């Protein structure tokens, strides 16, 4: 599509649609792009007394990006609740993306005073890496998607990555990526870009929690055909003696059943009370914290493996590290209190995954014997066993949606820890940049490269449509059931509305495993 | 102002050769570094390290 | 073609035929091939107190070659002087090879006693190195060529080259070959191998002498209509004045004439005579040669571009380093006296090419006036210049035939300067060797590589058929030319034969340049 001035290159597509077991969304947005690092490059690097585990090198582009990795980006709160309160699972299926409206306006600075004027001849240029040769730096929970609101207009991040570093120096390994380097398109006023996109098949997300503990799965009116050892000794004249006694696990015993499965696996993290006298009176944050080790740099393990939050009736508790956390309206950047930030809760699958701040259980480290004590020790950290059954994280209505899988030989369940879809060929990154127009140039020549251009930025519309895929619940369930519901009582604002100055704010976070399931 | 593009097909002759022994290869040095060779600085200037001839394969007289 | 122990796998074919204008001769000769270098690969290098002229560094192969590059492995004795007395020209077409008849036989050294006996399952390894993939070591005027005698046996002599060398030690870009990285064909005795080749296009050797000079071209009847300056003063009263004075040239001044064309290039060698006394008493054989300088090594030009060996009166003088030299039969290796050796003579090419032992010429070095008179200098080398027309050296019955021209981004009339085709794609090499067969082994294990092998050679016949195509002469001279022939004279031995003990020798070079020709 082409054509004059005077023509709008597209239309403002935003609602959803609802078919069967298919929901298609699409939301438009204005944005803003400005000219970043004045059209260079830069190396960048971490300051030079900056600890070790804090040393990075890369570059930082000229460029921008686009990017709507935030389900709050295609669904508005009332589809969110008609999503997570009937079904039970739901993925997505197709992409399309489009760009549109494009003007380019140039800016003079004349005497503190500020005059704007189009520049109808200016271009934009566009490209979408859809080979995955840049490296991915979507999937890093960054601020700058799309805003939630579809009222509001958003500035485009800039594009920067990190490559292979020894302190704050780099190696002959790291590479560099000049992203002019790429085929792209040049959009003047008048034409716009499009393109489409097919997820590859992942496993529906579970939004549902399960009705059964996975300790809890037998018949309570039938003993068991096993036998469990239930005693050692037996009592003889006035003393015991070692006698080995057997019994069949029923209800009265249930925590001695035989069992064919496990709970999923753990690494154990510090518990903290939203309570402030509850914990101690010093600086723990690094500490205490649970971290990996990799190339002679520790790491925060954040959030992790997905386990339980706490165990019941323990709410004012939470693991450390090991939770979402998503900031309230208006919330600063550094050092906020608890009570500007919102924290996520993960106790709907304390069914099969193990409490986050406890031990996994406790295992036999010695030989006992006629002079020898049973010995047992905790363990804080286990890996995968065969056997084991374990749920994801949960996705929110502001979390991220997927992730990349990273090109390595071996992975073990990628899914990506922050919740979401792993996918091996994720939605393309989209990059764009405003085209330099240089200044009024010296009539002598000069081989010196340009350093004045016109001050000039873009704006315009984008749009993505997303379809998705329903997996509706087969229940047969009596009672009903917890569903996602506003409150009736009265309040000075309604929830996920502006305010009376025009602020939209999301008040809490939601997750989406509201329906049950039997284990 | 404006752009500019050229595009030029090259044909290439491959190497056929039955040496045993490895050749010289041109390579980047491994060692850490202030700054990669053939890249941008800290403020955004291109430079090349060293010129790079042609010659490295190696051919019978 | 295979079959049995008792069936030979080829005829005895060695002849010539002449039909029109093609010459096809075949020769076939026995040969016999040892065990080389133990069955290894060496590493060689030259010695450690050798001047840096002569360093070195390479590898010797457990590989034979089979060599054919001279003319007296084609023609006879009689078969040559058909050839140089009746053809203006001739150059080599086509080509066959073939090996046969193979036996290998194992020795063995008990008490002093040989025992040799066949070895029916034995078997030898031969490839042609079709695609030019390996150092080319003919073309060196090496021995080990197919004897001149068909009667006689000949050693396969040994593969070895050279790389590139510091001193005595190699560099990073000096390559190793192995020879059994090339597919090869296996024979039994029973097998036989062949194969064919097609020369390319090349210039006809010219077969013929000049019967006119360079410098005598014109009509000596007709006085040209030019002028040159053939006086500088004239006589003015009991004195001279400068005064230009031009005449047309005749043949009372017939050195004055102007002229087309100039000699052929020219690069000085020094001049030594026959008669031992006319030679200075000192030892200037390598201070006063002539030499090239490459990588700040000094090698002697031998015999170097062709030039005349000497002018007219003058055969006992020839140059230090500008004609081939061949030895007279049995003569040794080191420091033998002259008459152990047949210096040849290129007499024929003083009508266009220089005297070897000359100078080009003369030019002027100032700028003459009222004071100062004009000044020349001899020209000791003349590179080529535009005009300039030569003769290339001359091919003898006992010379090489062809060389490889070297692949590279230029070179200037690559005919090889010992005479004879330059090709870009010549003849091939052809490898062979023995299969080893290893000793008794031991009843345990060991991963150490074998040494010890049961000792054997091979021996079997060769033949080699080519195709030559003629260039008839077509003259009109009247009275008749010079042929080469024998002398009638009584003799105890013929030229060309055995004598009384078996030993066939050649008692003289015998050139090809016999006919004349108009310049």
Same mark, same amino acid.
């Given at each position: 599509g082409a054509d004059g001035v005077?023509?709008?290159s597209g239309n403002w597509h935003c609602d959803s649609t609802w078919m069967g077991d298919r929901v298609i969304t699409t939301s438009t947005r204005t944005w803003a792009l400005p000219t970043y690092n004045n059209h260079l490059y830069k190396q960048i690097s971490s300051q030079s007394g900056a600890s070790n585990d804090n040393h990075y090198f890369g570059y930082s582009t000229p460029w921008g990006y686009f990017d709507f990795n935030r389900f709050h980006c295609h669904f508005s709160p009332r589809d969110w609740q008609r999503l997570i309160n009937n079904n039970w699972g739901f993925r997505p299926k197709r992409l399309n993306f489009k760009l549109f409206n494009i003007q380019v306006k140039e800016v003079t600075q004349n005497d503190g005073t500020t005059t704007i004027a189009n520049n109808l001849t200016s271009t934009v240029q566009v490209f979408t890496d859809s080979e995955y040769q840049l490296p991915y730096v979507? @999937?890093? %929970?960054? *601020?700058?998607?799309?805003?939630?609101?579809?009222?509001d207009v958003f500035m485009v991040p800039q594009y920067g990555y990190l490559t292979l570093n020894n302190g704050s120096q780099a190696v002959g390994r790291s590479s560099f990526y000049c992203l002019e380097y790429f085929p792209s398109q040049m959009l003047r006023t008048g034409n716009n870009f499009t393109f489409s996109y097919t997820f590859e098949d992942v496993p529906f997300h579970s939004s549902y929690a399960h009705s059964q503990s996975l300790d809890r799965l037998m018949n309570p009116l039938i003993d068991q055909y096993l036998y469990y050892l239930s005693k050692t000794n037996a009592p003889s004249g006035t003393t015991t003696m070692s006698r080995l006694q057997f019994s069949q696990a029923g209800a009265s015993d249930i925590r001695d059943q035989s069992r064919n499965w496990l709970p999923g696996p753990c690494y154990r993290q510090q518990r903290v009370s939203k309570?402030? %006298?509850? +914990? &101690? +009176?010093? =600086? /723990?944050?690094?500490?205490g914290a649970t971290k990996y080790h990799l190339n002679g740099r520790d790491s925060l393990? &954040?959030? @992790?493996?997905?386990? %339980?939050?706490? !165990?019941?009736?323990?709410? !004012?508790y939470f693991p450390q590290s090991g939770v979402l956390i998503f900031g309230k309206q208006?919330?600063?950047?550094?050092?906020? =209190?608890? $009570? !500007?930030v919102m924290i996520t809760d993960e106790e709907e699958i304390r069914t099969t995954n193990p409490v986050?701040? $406890? *031990? /996994?259980g406790s295992v036999s480290t010695n030989l006992q014997s006629g002079n020898t004590q049973a010995a047992t020790t905790d363990v804080n950290t286990q890996g995968v066993l065969p056997g084991m059954v374990w749920q994801d994280r949960d996705v929110y209505l502001q979390g991220p949606i997927w992730a990349k899988i990273p090109h390595t030989d071996g992975h073990f369940h990628p899914s990506p820890l922050m919740g979401g879809f792993g996918l091996k060929h994720p939605p393309p990154q989209i990059l764009i940049k405003n085209t330099p127009v240089p200044a009024n140039p010296s009539t002598t020549f000069s081989a010196a490269k340009f350093a004045s251009f016109i001050t000039q930025y873009s704006t315009g519309q984008v749009s993505v449509e997303i379809e998705w895929e329903l997996q509706k619940e087969n229940s047969k369930r009596w009672n009903p059931e917890i569903q996602y519901t506003s409150n009736y009582n009265k309040s000075v604002n309604v929830d996920f509305t502006v305010d009376t100055n025009g602020v939209y704010s999301e008040p809490r976070p939601i997750g989406t495993r509201y329906l049950t399931r039997n284990l």
């Open positions: 005077g023509n709008s979507l @999937g890093s %929970a960054h *601020q700058g998607c799309l805003p939630p609101f579809p009222a309570t402030a %006298a509850d +914990n &101690n +009176n010093s =600086d /723990y944050s690094w500490t393990v &954040n959030p @992790g493996p997905a386990m %339980a939050s706490h !165990k019941d009736d323990e709410e !004012k208006d919330s600063g950047k550094t050092n906020v =209190d608890i $009570e !500007k986050a701040t $406890e *031990q /996994y």
